């Protein structure tokens, strides 16, 4: 819990207020462009279910991963910025992303 983007956003978005979550990805794209991935390339999910979809293009993402020294209450994260294709599992009506399956 310090000033880098991952420590700040993991806290603000209520991911580390009561636990340290090991890894989390944030996507820096407009919400509707992230929602548009549910009608893009259909692929199988890691678990073999087939409601996963891969973005046609790469998207700006930040990976946040807990360092080896992190312990609740002071969660500590390494921040890695990258542009990657995201894979999301979709459900509902409207058919929207409900889980992040990976980045590729």
């Amino acid at each position: 819990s310090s000033s880098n983007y991952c420590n700040q956003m993991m806290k603000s978005r209520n991911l580390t207020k009561d636990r340290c979550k090991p890894v989390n990805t944030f996507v820096h794209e407009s919400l509707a462009d992230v929602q548009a991935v549910c009608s893009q390339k259909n692929v199988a999910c890691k678990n073999g279910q087939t409601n996963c979809y891969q973005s046609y293009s790469t998207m700006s993402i930040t990976d946040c991963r807990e360092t080896g020294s992190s312990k609740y209450p002071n969660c500590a994260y390494k921040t890695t910025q990258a542009n990657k294709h995201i894979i999301v599992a979709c459900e509902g009506n409207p058919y929207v992303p409900v889980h992040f399956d990976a980045s590729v």
Binding site: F26, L31, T62, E91, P97, V98
Partner: peptide
């Protein structure tokens, strides 16, 4: 209370 779609946005989207 929070739907799964809402939870995905809170945890993963930073428009």
């Amino acid at each position: 209370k929070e739907t799964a779609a809402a939870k995905f946005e809170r945890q993963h989207a930073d428009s």
